[PDB]
């Protein structure tokens, strides 16, 4: 599965949402006992990787905004309406949705909420299988060529 590319409209949010979404995921690596440091290693007990989106370099920049890009460009390329009309509720409209559940310990923990009082969608339930699916269609087109 490979659709399509994305347009720029969505860049007035695109910012915004990486210093969100760096501001939630980067709370997960941690759990096992994972630090911050200068070179790539795990011997040692440290990640690299639990920096701020825009404290890292650009290539590691953009891996933070690579899986927001994946939730976007198969929304865009899915046919069903995807556009921004409920705008995102963090740093473009004062209401306060995102920052909600967290808990810090000696650790980088920002706070990915775990939204839970809501239905989901009918899509994006199906979906998981199609995200989780995309890694192996991305790691296959690498991999058989």
């Not at 949705?97 to 839970?116: E, I, R």
Request: one cysteine or more; aromatic letters at 6%; hydrophobic letters at 35%.
């Amino acid at each position: 599965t490979s659709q399509i590319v994305l347009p720029p409209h969505l860049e007035r949010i695109r910012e915004r949402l990486a210093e969100n979404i760096h501001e939630l995921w980067v709370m997960n690596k941690i759990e096992l006992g994972w630090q911050y440091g200068p070179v790539r290693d795990d011997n040692k007990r440290q990640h690299p990787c639990l920096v701020e989106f825009c404290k890292l370099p650009e290539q590691e920049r953009n891996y933070n905004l690579q899986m927001s890009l994946e939730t976007l460009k198969t929304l865009l390329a899915l046919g069903c309406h995807v556009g921004i009309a409920d705008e995102h509720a963090e740093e473009k409209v004062k209401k306060m949705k995102l920052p909600k559940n967290y808990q810090l310990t000696s650790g980088y923990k920002p706070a990915p909420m775990d939204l839970s009082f809501i239905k989901l969608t009918p899509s994006q339930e199906a979906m998981v299988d199609k995200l989780a699916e995309n890694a192996h269609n991305v790691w296959a087109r690498d991999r058989i060529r």
